[PDB]
């Protein structure tokens, strides 16, 4: 706009200068936070120590499954080891006095046949 320069300095390898054109027209850093950076680590250290206290969780549940299975299995063997031999010693006991129940009928057609000749040798 054709202006006048306010010459502001000259030295070895240069020259500065303002060129005002049309008047202007009248119109705490803080150190304490090194404890903020181990506040951040306050919550990391918590998170990973929880997908651990929740993971060492899904763990000794595996202990169960793995064994609360085997422990339900032999639960069947030692149910069915006597669902056998206590069904089967109820059997040996059952027949044997159904043999006797046959034989003690014989001693009875027998110790009567005896007493009916001791009655012939008396008639």
């Amino acid at each position: 706009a054709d202006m006048e320069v306010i010459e502001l300095n000259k030295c070895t390898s240069g020259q500065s200068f303002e060129v005002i054109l049309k008047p202007p027209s009248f119109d705490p850093s803080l150190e304490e936070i090194q404890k903020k950076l181990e506040a951040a680590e306050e919550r990391r250290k918590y998170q990973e120590a929880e997908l651990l206290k929740h993971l060492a969780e899904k763990r000794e549940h595996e202990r169960e499954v793995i064994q609360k299975a085997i422990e339900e299995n032999n639960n069947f063997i030692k149910m069915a080891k006597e669902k056998l031999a206590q069904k089967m010693e109820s059997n040996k006991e059952n027949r044997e006095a159904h043999l006797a129940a046959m034989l003690e009928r014989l001693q009875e057609k027998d110790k009567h046949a005896e007493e009916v000749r001791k009655n012939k040798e008396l008639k």
């Binding site: 046949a113 009916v116 009655n119």
Partner: protein
């Protein structure tokens, strides 16, 4: 697996003889020695009926009991005489009486132990003894009375193994003794509690089969034993022959008896006669089936009409095709469908062995748990208490060492068995 044979009494023994010589033919044995025959089967299952001794030799597993010499030296002097091991004969000496008690109590028990002493041998010798069978009369003491004892003493010693008899139910027509009813009722009692199966054989039948069905005028104890002889081969075959069954005798019973009492098979046969009559080859299968299922061809006098078959086995003989057999067998279960029980399902099984009997190209034998057997029992108890009226002949047992109520005590045990078969006219 192995079976022994007790054969006691004049009637029991003269059956036994003919039986033995007929089956001895089928396997082919010299009156003494060993095998003579172009067949080769025979000997698979000769094991079962013949304990074999040194040299060549084959000797039956037989015990012959009688309470008097007479009828034992009949066998030894007759047909297949000296075939039986000498001291397998248990002699009698004494009376027989034709009286149950003498044979079951006094003169019987007098022997008995000596019989038990042969059986105990043969059976204890026998490598896997399966069971015994016995033959005898039921009216008359030495058979009916000794045997019913034998069996009672046979069990108890052998609970274990299965028992089995061809017993001869006596008729008012064609018999010797007024008393037989008394005799029978007493053994019938005995049997129904100590045997596992009991082939019923009426002499009423046996005689009737010869005059109604043979024209045979003077029927002996000869031609008449002849039938029983045959019928008995019939029944036995499949424990002694093929390998198309396998016939455990136990299996055989379990599959024949529903109810532990009532093991009273009335038997029957295919063809017949011996002397002046033949068969012009024509035993055809069909005419062989509605023949073994004809009552006028039953070995007990009943009539498997009134009274229904509980179970029924049949076994066929001869190189004939069974592709017809099941198909005739079928047919009769429709042609007479009414008179099988339904409540035991597949209750008539039939099998075939194919090496014919003496003579006869094709033949059939029928085993038969018919509650029409009630017919037989109810006939004998009909003349029994017609005797126990004001207690007639009874006095022979009165003193022999028997009791008042003991007759009645078996009059009753029968009268139950009667109304138990009528109880199985079921639903």
């Amino acid at each position: 697996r192995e079976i022994v044979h007790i054969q006691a009494g004049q009637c029991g023994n003269q059956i036994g003889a003919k039986f033995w010589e007929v089956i001895s033919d089928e396997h082919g044995i010299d009156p003494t020695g060993s095998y003579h025959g172009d067949s080769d089967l025979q000997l698979e299952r000769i094991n079962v009926y013949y304990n074999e001794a040194t040299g060549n030799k084959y000797v039956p597993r037989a015990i012959l009991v009688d309470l008097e010499p007479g009828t034992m030296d009949s066998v030894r002097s007759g047909p297949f005489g000296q075939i039986f091991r000498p001291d397998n004969f248990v002699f009698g000496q004494s009376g027989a009486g034709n009286n149950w008690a003498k044979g079951h109590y006094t003169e019987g028990a007098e022997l008995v132990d000596s019989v038990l002493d042969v059986v105990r041998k043969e059976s204890e010798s026998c490598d896997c003894l399966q069971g015994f069978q016995l033959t005898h009369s039921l009216g008359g003491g030495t058979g009916s009375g000794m045997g019913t004892l034998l069996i009672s003493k046979i069990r108890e010693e052998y609970p274990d193994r299965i028992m089995n008899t061809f017993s001869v139910m006596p008729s008012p027509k064609v018999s010797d003794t007024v008393v037989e009813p008394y005799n029978a009722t007493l053994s019938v009692h005995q049997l129904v509690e100590n045997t596992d199966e009991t082939y019923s054989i009426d002499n009423e039948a046996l005689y009737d089969i010869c005059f109604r069905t043979l024209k045979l005028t003077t029927p002996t104890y000869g031609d008449l034993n002849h039938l029983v002889s045959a019928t008995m081969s019939g029944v036995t075959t499949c424990l002694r022959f093929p390998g198309q069954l396998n016939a455990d005798l136990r299996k055989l019973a379990v599959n024949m008896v529903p109810f532990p009492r009532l093991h009273f098979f009335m038997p029957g046969f295919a063809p017949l006669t011996s002397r002046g009559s033949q068969q012009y080859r024509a035993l055809t299968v069909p005419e062989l089936t509605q023949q073994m299922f004809d009552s006028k061809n039953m070995m007990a006098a009943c009539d498997p009409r009134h009274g229904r078959y509980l179970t029924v086995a049949a076994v066929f003989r001869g190189r004939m095709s069974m592709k017809e057999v099941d198909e005739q067998m079928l047919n009769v279960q429709n042609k007479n469908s009414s008179y099988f029980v339904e409540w035991i399902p597949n209750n008539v099984k039939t099998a075939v062995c194919d090496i014919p009997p003496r003579g006869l190209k094709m033949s059939a034998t029928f085993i038969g748990n018919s509650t029409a057997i009630q017919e037989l029992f109810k006939r004998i108890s009909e003349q029994f208490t017609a005797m126990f009226r004001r207690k007639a002949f009874l006095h022979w047992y009165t003193g022999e060492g028997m009791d008042e109520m003991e007759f009645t005590e078996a009059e009753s045990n029968m009268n139950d068995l009667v109304s138990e078969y009528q109880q199985y006219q079921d639903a």
